[PDB]
Symmetry: D3
Subunit: 140 residues, 6 copies
Amino acid sequence: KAEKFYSLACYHAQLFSKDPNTKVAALVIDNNNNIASVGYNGLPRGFEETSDRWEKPMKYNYVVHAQANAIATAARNGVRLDGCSIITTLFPCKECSKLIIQSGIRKVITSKPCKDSSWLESFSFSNEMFDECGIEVEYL
Amino acid sequence: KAEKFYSLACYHAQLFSKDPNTKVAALVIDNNNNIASVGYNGLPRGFEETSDRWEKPMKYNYVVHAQANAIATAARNGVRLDGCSIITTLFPCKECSKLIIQSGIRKVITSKPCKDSSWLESFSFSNEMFDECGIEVEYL
Amino acid sequence: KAEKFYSLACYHAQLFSKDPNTKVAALVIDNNNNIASVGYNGLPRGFEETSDRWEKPMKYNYVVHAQANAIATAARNGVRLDGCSIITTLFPCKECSKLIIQSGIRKVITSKPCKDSSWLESFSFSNEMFDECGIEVEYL
Amino acid sequence: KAEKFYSLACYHAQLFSKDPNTKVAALVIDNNNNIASVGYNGLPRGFEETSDRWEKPMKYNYVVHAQANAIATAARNGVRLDGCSIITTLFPCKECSKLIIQSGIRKVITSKPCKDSSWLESFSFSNEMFDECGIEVEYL
Amino acid sequence: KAEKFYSLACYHAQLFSKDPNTKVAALVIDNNNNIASVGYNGLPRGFEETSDRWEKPMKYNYVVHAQANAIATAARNGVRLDGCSIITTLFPCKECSKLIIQSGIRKVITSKPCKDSSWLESFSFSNEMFDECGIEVEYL
Amino acid sequence: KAEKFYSLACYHAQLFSKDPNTKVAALVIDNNNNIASVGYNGLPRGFEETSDRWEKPMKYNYVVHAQANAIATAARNGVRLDGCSIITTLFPCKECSKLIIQSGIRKVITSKPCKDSSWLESFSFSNEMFDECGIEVEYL
Ligand SMILES: Nc1ccn([C@H]2C[C@H](O)[C@@H](COP(=O)(O)OP(=O)(O)OP(=O)(O)O)O2)c(=O)n1
Ligand SMILES: Nc1ccn([C@H]2C[C@H](O)[C@@H](COP(=O)(O)OP(=O)(O)OP(=O)(O)O)O2)c(=O)n1
Ligand SMILES: Nc1ccn([C@H]2C[C@H](O)[C@@H](COP(=O)(O)OP(=O)(O)OP(=O)(O)O)O2)c(=O)n1
Ligand SMILES: Nc1ccn([C@H]2C[C@H](O)[C@@H](COP(=O)(O)OP(=O)(O)OP(=O)(O)O)O2)c(=O)n1
Ligand SMILES: Nc1ccn([C@H]2C[C@H](O)[C@@H](COP(=O)(O)OP(=O)(O)OP(=O)(O)O)O2)c(=O)n1
Ligand SMILES: Nc1ccn([C@H]2C[C@H](O)[C@@H](COP(=O)(O)OP(=O)(O)OP(=O)(O)O)O2)c(=O)n1
Ligand SMILES: Nc1ccn([C@H]2C[C@H](O)[C@@H](COP(=O)(O)O)O2)c(=O)n1
Ligand SMILES: Nc1ccn([C@H]2C[C@H](O)[C@@H](COP(=O)(O)O)O2)c(=O)n1
Ligand SMILES: Nc1ccn([C@H]2C[C@H](O)[C@@H](COP(=O)(O)O)O2)c(=O)n1
Ligand SMILES: Nc1ccn([C@H]2C[C@H](O)[C@@H](COP(=O)(O)O)O2)c(=O)n1
Ligand SMILES: Nc1ccn([C@H]2C[C@H](O)[C@@H](COP(=O)(O)O)O2)c(=O)n1
Ligand SMILES: Nc1ccn([C@H]2C[C@H](O)[C@@H](COP(=O)(O)O)O2)c(=O)n1
Ligand SMILES: [Mg+2]
Ligand SMILES: [Mg+2]
Ligand SMILES: [Mg+2]
Ligand SMILES: [Mg+2]
Ligand SMILES: [Mg+2]
Ligand SMILES: [Mg+2]
Ligand SMILES: [Zn+2]
Ligand SMILES: [Zn+2]
Ligand SMILES: [Zn+2]
Ligand SMILES: [Zn+2]
Ligand SMILES: [Zn+2]
Ligand SMILES: [Zn+2]
């Protein structure tokens, strides 16, 4: 089931993300394997999406990460995430990892980062926080 | 009312936040002036808070912002924030601004940043996003 | 957007549904295009899925429909659906249509049934109920 | 308490159901004996109720069952049913039994079917699914 | 509909309430006539119900009112009551009226008090608060 | 943490309560130390606040207690209080104690009453109900 959800998230990212380089999506799943929340990476809702704003490095000032969006959407709609797992097509950065911990999510399921990534340092802080705070990491 | 909530938020930060430089709190409030969520800045729950982890600039890798915490708590407990206002003792950084927009919060109430702040560039992106996305900014 | 959700729903069905003839999925989506609930067709959770139980016509006694599942999951988790739209890879049968009406879903988005379908009579009652009760039907 | 809730449901059916032959109601009860959801059998809300549409067999194309309505109402309003019991004046048919299982309801409390019933075959499938999926049945 | 709910409430009180003098129940109902919460008058859950504790006037120190119970249950289970109506077999006392106003209930439906009632003074304050705060009172 | 929440509640009462003699506030806290609900004592929302209505003894006919307001607000907004603790600047009266028990709150954290209080008899009934119904009382 986890691998199928990962495949489902890869497709969601390809369908919806306007990021020209890296399309990211995340699914928050409860203990009955039901979907509690979904997000993809994009500029905030209604924010004009121009070519200049989607180029690197400018885009980092504007882009909302997929995992942050799944959690913000649950806050917006009042969907309780405590105790769920998060399945994400990309390992969460340090800022998303903070949100995952504080939102009560207990497990991150994803793929091992391409260690040519420019996010490797951010991911190192993610792993330090996850392991000490007791959030499991599972790689498919 | 907004001013009394800001004062309450200031006291919340002084009571709870362990940041040695800048203690921040935020309150999310609905149209009846009822409190829907509260947060303060701090390291993730259960992350050992050593002096080295709270020193600047290392603390930025670990500290969870007050507004991010209030939103993440609402996702954790399934408390709907759509349509609420957020009263914060510090203007939200660009990342918190993305969360505010995506969680359906309509209005930010805070103090005008001290123009000696090191966060002015981040706040500059916050206001560009708030203005295009139609989030009202109210200064006390 | 509706078309991308329909495509995502199609992939969800192909990944998860064990029906050997017709795999169906549905997405319930609010006015911000956020996903509130998801379902696919399958036997009840934990019911052993033997070849005999999945053969037609015996499977109709056991199979839970995708739209029924998405609504039942929302009841299970307390996720409010009032005012949402439902995007489904198959037009809802008359029983699913009753659930859609009673759960406050306002709009059905799907494909026009293949006029070789064995469900045309059931769909005929669905549309009579949708029209009198004011549920919009939108075909992709 | 269970028998009093059953009596309460019998009265609710008599008060509200327009079915000319069989009036049905159901109460979803949590582990503190609080009422989480209530339904009765009827045509969908706002659907014209004519004599022709309430006659047998035509009515089966239109009538929403009491247990299906209690669950659809919880989906509509975002009331969490997971782990509750359902007390119903009539044994749930196979379609309602699927919804009961998927909505997380753990126990069905009702009266033994009159085994002159035309629903006996549908009830046989209900019992097969309940017993294998671990939903208890209690007869008063 | 309001009259049928009042009748159902009367029966609920007769079935469940242990008050030897006056059995009271209340139903909180949304704009679709769905039941959001139900209560009846009784001592707190688990408080031993001796004859001395149910005798007047000692019972007033312990008895929980039906309308207070329906609201407290909604707080317990997180069921939103904002905008609902309350149908009660007895006019709410001044304390219940404060709860009704603060929980966002918009309308009280009940019977006109028997002018031999010992609660007329309390009801007098109830109506002054309902009128200034804009809660509609409807008598059956 | 409990003592800091008590200090936070004392300030909230001083900021917001218009009671000329005794300002009261209460915080409902979950097992992760997150704030679920907040209240202070005051006349009902929108009720004209005149000097005559805030004088003793007239005010008791109108004033909503802080703990009752925290619970009514949770009912209004659909915030689930079951299993939380309540931290209050004043010991709950017998009527608030009934609401605390019925709303699923499991622990009262407060300060020992000034035993020159005119509420001592009401508090005696509170303690009888709390101890028999299994709600803990903790004094700071
Ligand atoms: N189901 C959804 C819908 C939206 N979003 C997030 C992704 C972006 O951060 C933001 C906005 O998404 P879009 O840009 O796709 O949608 P807009 O509303 O901005 O419209 P448009 O596509 O015209 O830009 O919301 C999400 O995570 N999940
Ligand atoms: N009501 C609360 C409780 C917690 N938090 C946030 C602040 C921090 O980002 C994180 C953890 O807070 P603390 O460090 O104060 O609490 P811990 O659980 O880590 O315990 P300790 O005080 O021993 O560090 O949760 C919050 O915003 N609001
Ligand atoms: N995210 C989910 C998970 C489940 N279901 C529904 C589909 C079926 O009606 C039922 C059970 O699904 P599965 O058969 O896939 O899962 P089980 O729990 O039965 O396990 P298994 O795959 O071993 O049969 O729940 C759903 O609609 N959406
Ligand atoms: N508290 C309620 C209210 C309604 N329903 C269900 C029963 C029917 O399936 C549908 C419609 O009920 P009614 O026919 O009684 O109400 P309408 O809104 O259709 O009005 P009318 O009575 O004029 O037909 O809603 C329910 O289960 N519980
Ligand atoms: N569906 C319910 C269940 C309970 N209550 C309220 C009524 C009383 O104020 C309290 C306790 O009800 P009971 O006394 O009937 O139930 P107990 O749990 O105390 O058990 P017992 O019947 O053995 O006294 O809860 C309610 O309003 N609605
Ligand atoms: N965050 C809040 C807001 C309000 N209340 C309660 C306290 C009173 O019982 C009632 C009304 O509060 P106020 O009198 O402060 O507010 P009003 O809306 O009545 O306005 P005003 O201050 O002009 O009287 O609501 C509360 O407990 N918590
Ligand atoms: N935890 C993360 C990290 C990154 N991203 C998003 C931000 C960018 O849109 C993209 C990475 O862009 P790039 O590969 O160009 O750095 O992935 C995300 O959604 N979640
Ligand atoms: N929108 C923001 C921006 C910053 N902070 C927090 C992070 C740090 O803990 C502190 C600022 O630290 P300093 O003053 O050392 O930059 O405020 C916050 O909670 N919300
Ligand atoms: N509204 C509907 C109608 C049908 N189905 C499911 C039931 C079966 O699993 C499949 C159709 O099977 P067949 O094509 O063999 O009739 O679609 C569904 O999920 N929703
Ligand atoms: N599980 C079930 C089965 C049936 N019914 C309803 C449908 C009809 O309105 C009535 C039975 O009608 P009859 O006895 O004429 O078949 O009961 C129901 O609400 N729930
Ligand atoms: N608004 C009110 C007022 C009273 N009661 C209850 C309290 C007692 O149990 C009963 C009245 O008792 P008596 O008739 O002896 O005064 O009604 C109630 O539930 N709601
Ligand atoms: N459990 C209680 C008891 C009392 N109060 C409020 C009611 C009055 O506003 C004040 C006490 O007023 P006094 O001290 O004049 O009796 O405290 C409260 O909020 N909660
Ligand atoms: Mg966009
Ligand atoms: Mg800590
Ligand atoms: Mg299965
Ligand atoms: Mg009708
Ligand atoms: Mg009892
Ligand atoms: Mg006021
Ligand atoms: Zn990230
Ligand atoms: Zn920030
Ligand atoms: Zn169907
Ligand atoms: Zn049925
Ligand atoms: Zn009362
Ligand atoms: Zn009190």
